[PDB]
């Protein structure tokens, strides 16, 4: 039948999860942002559409920092992106507190990953409406 796209964790007959795919549409509809990996670091940059002359220039910042070595930028539903960073920040604080060493990038990636994947497991939550580019420099 149909309706496989109305509840978040439901598998459609072809093995897909339409709500996540619709979340992607929200992402593609957003500002463009990128990340370039260099020989000893990473660069983040994003497009900030000027709706009007009323927007105080340089004020509505988008790039977000996690801990002191991670940078995060995203496209899509901005509020969702902040939510995801708030989580990443806790995730990082928790890691440092137990292991002392600030969180390795890969480790941090999975923290964000598992949390996001979690929102595709239940119909009582909505998937994140953002694709996020993040990174930093760590032990190696």
């Amino acid at each position: 039948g149909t309706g496989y796209d109305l509840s978040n964790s439901v598998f459609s007959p072809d093995g897909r999860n339409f709500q996540v795919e619709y979340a992607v549409k929200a992402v593609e509809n957003g500002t463009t942002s990128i990340g370039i990996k260099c020989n000893d670091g990473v660069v983040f940059a994003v497009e900030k559409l000027i709706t009007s002359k009323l927007l105080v220039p340089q004020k509505n910042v988008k790039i977000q920092v996690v801990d002191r070595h991670i940078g995060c930028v995203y496209s899509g539903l901005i509020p969702d992106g902040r939510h995801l960073v708030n989580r990443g920040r806790e995730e990082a604080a928790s890691f440092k507190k137990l292991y002392k060493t600030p969180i390795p990038i890969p480790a941090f990636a999975d923290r964000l990953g598992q949390y996001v994947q979690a929102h595709t497991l239940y119909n009582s939550v909505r998937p994140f409406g953002v694709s996020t580019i993040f990174g930093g420099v760590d032990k190696n």
Binding site: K59, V61, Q64, V65, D67, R68, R89, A93, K97
Partner: peptide, 16 residues
């Protein structure tokens, strides 16, 4: 000491 290092880290969040 750890509390203070965190206060610094946290204050830097979304703080241009």
């Amino acid at each position: 000491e750890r509390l203070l290092k965190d206060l610094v880290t946290e204050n830097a969040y979304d703080n241009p």
